[PDB]
Amino acid sequence: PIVQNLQGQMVHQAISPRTLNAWVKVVEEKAFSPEVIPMFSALSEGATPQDLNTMLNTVAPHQAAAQMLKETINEEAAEWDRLHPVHAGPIAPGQMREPRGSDIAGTTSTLQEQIGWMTHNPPIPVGEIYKRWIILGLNKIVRMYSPTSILDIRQGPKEPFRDYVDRFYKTLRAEQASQEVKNWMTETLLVQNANPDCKTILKALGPGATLEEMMTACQGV
Amino acid sequence: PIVQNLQGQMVHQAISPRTLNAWVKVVEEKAFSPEVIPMFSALSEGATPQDLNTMLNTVAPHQAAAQMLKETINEEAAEWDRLHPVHAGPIAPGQMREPRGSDIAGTTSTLQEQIGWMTHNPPIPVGEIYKRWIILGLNKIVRMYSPTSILDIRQGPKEPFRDYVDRFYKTLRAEQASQEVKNWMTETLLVQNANPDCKTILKALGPGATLEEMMTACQGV
Amino acid sequence: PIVQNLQGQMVHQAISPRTLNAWVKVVEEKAFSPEVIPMFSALSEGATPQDLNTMLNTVAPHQAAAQMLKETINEEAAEWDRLHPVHAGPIAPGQMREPRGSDIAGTTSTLQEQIGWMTHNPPIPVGEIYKRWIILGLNKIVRMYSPTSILDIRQGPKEPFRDYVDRFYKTLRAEQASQEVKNWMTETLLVQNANPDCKTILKALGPGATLEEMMTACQGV
Amino acid sequence: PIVQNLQGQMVHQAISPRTLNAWVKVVEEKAFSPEVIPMFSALSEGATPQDLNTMLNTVAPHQAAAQMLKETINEEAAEWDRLHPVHAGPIAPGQMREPRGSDIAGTTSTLQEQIGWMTHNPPIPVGEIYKRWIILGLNKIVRMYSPTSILDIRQGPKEPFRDYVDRFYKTLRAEQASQEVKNWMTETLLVQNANPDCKTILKALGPGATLEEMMTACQGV
């Protein structure tokens, strides 16, 4: 992250060891479940690209996930270079150069370059964009490691309706289908895969019932 | 939150990553049980409206809960605008403008505006009011996700009386009935739904016994 | 339909009784299955709006279907009037007036008006548009009478793969989901609901296999 | 088709609605069995390319079959263009232009163009060639939908020999192997897959027996 020194100048502060250890616990203990992404986003809050690569070292022992992340990051860097062609010409002395795809990812840049790029009015946030690339890679990894299809999430004969709903929506978060397909899933498949008593009540409830009304009508069933 | 710099001026400090990760763990692991509210209140202690929106991003993947929160917040902002009509007229240069409903929630304001509004003598606490709106939304969410009715909390044949009492009062906290209805519940339904031996003792104890006396008379039963 | 007399002038010829009887057999014997629509389109080939109302009388004894058709036709006529506002002003003597929604459906027009409107260079086809409105109504009717969800079409343990595919695609034709949802259905649900041996082969076949390759690999399984 | 008016001039007559309905019944009821091809050839007798596209609309709801037909037709149109290069140069006023692949299929042409092309001495039959392309596509479709291999057609213990022969030759018609392979099949596989009593008689009958002699010697067996 970025901190101000006693003289009012922006200084890079490394991630503290217990934050890094929290991220290591997330990576090594949670099997890339969907909650790895909110936790990563919280733990890399306000980070520089050099900090993000420190957090990416924890993924390297997981070769398939690390390779998927590398492919996503290379694709994003190439796309960034294509959409930001390197202008050839003079530059104002008070203006800094334009980082490349290998620079936003911190492969060839240095710490002061990233601090200066991020600390500006108006800012060009290099940490947030690299973070979004990482999150796309992690979404792909969560999709790859998902153990069940949404078609296989079915309410047990004695399972409470809220628990089935939580499992259903967690798998839906993992699968990341298209928006229209997701709407069809939540409207139709949730009712279709409920157990007989809840299914009877939900069918009687009619189409277009909100999830809150469905939870109300199935509370003790 | 708000901190003082070396020059004695109020400065906004972001929520630390492990605090945000604690909130993420609460959201993703506790299924919106009633204790989510004390934990949220502790974790957002002394926060600005911009910090509260960072904590609200964690809820967004939970669509029903996020929508219920959005509806509660929109209702509260509209009510605030109605009860605080925008006065048209001159304002003192030493006095700041009046934030709107979309400003207390931090949708259109900026960080310095919120810092200045909160840091004043006397203060107009924008963090506390937005926090109370969030807590109303969360109370509704806890009500929606509650798995059992208070009518279905019944002491097991071998369950200790203190454990049944704890389950009963936790469900009562979740359900949030009216105050008179809650008093009727704790006075009548708790005794009605106890197991036969404890029920015999409590009936012999008479009406208007305090909960402490009931716990005393049922300790090993 | 429209025929030329011996003098070269366009003349309306009524639908022959055995064509009408074929349509009656379709309506009264097929329970509004999806093939009612291709058959109706073939049997009303080149018809005038007055002929289409003769074919619509056969549906009138089926009150729910007839009412759904009437609602669809009224909606389409209102939309046509809205998108074709009645211009107030002079009209060329060699140009005919503009039919209204109640005129394209033949409620207030006469036979010669429809013949003249359809027989023109360039033509304004009143039969085709009314026919498309009828087809929208019939699609809704086929959806209403569909006995099974697409989620309930599952290959039998000894059912040949081609027969399961035919049932699946016929139900898909009946249900008329969105295009993206239909693509998801044919790509995912067809494989998910196959029987174990065909499912093993199709999973080994990999994603993005064409339906022809799936039929080839499952022929005798 | 093409008809002569009262003045002796060739006029296009549309396909009658009950002919189109017969074709619709063939498409929607017979599951693309091998007899769909003789029926299609009979029902499109003397048709123009514009009529053939009307009959092709009935196949469009069957997406796999429709796509296979479209691929076959595109391939044939490209081959026709390659073998009939568009000559650049003057043309006789009494001679019509040369239709392209998109014109014989009626995508860009008009009705009078096709009537003039077909009605000529000597004729250039555009209906017959497009019909042969359609028939190639339909042969591929019949192959795709075939439920059984020729290797799986085996005489039942009590099945009459003529019925087994009919099933065998119908599957052989569906499969459309090479001519030499088909000759090997009818000479060897038919005898190999017969039931024991008929097999004994056919082996005693010797190689090179005609099918009539085999039917004679197995009549009541």
Author numbering:
A (entry chain A), B (entry chain A), C (entry chain A), D (entry chain A): 1 to 221
From the paper:
The HIV-1 capsid is a fullerene cone made of quasi-equivalent hexamers and pentamers of the viral CA protein. Along the body of the cone, the CA subunits are assembled on a hexagonal lattice, with the CA amino-terminal domain (NTD) making hexameric rings that are linked together by the carboxy-terminal domain (CTD). Twelve CA pentamers occupy sharp points of curvature—termed declinations—exactly 12 of which are required for the capsid to completely close. Here, we identify a Thr-Val-Gly-Gly motif that modulates CA hexamer/pentamer switching by folding into a 310 helix in the pentamer and random coil in the hexamer.
To stabilize the 310 helix and thus favor the pentamer, we replaced the two glycines in the TVGG motif with alanine and proline. Next, we surmised that the Met66 gate must constitute part of the activation barrier for coil-to-helix switching. Thus, a constitutively open gate (M66A) should also favor pentamers, and indeed the CA-M66A mutant also assembled into T = 1 particles, as did the CA-G60A G61P M66A triple mutant. We solved the cryo-EM structures of these T = 1 capsids to 2.2 Å (CA-G60A G61P), 3.1 Å (CA-M66A), and 2.4 Å (CA-G60A G61P M66A). These confirmed that the mutant pentamers have the same structure as the WT pentamer, with the switch in the 310 helix configuration and the gate in the open configuration. In accordance with our prediction, the CA-M66A, CA-G60A G61P and CA-G60A G61P M66A T = 1 particles were not stabilized by the FG peptide.
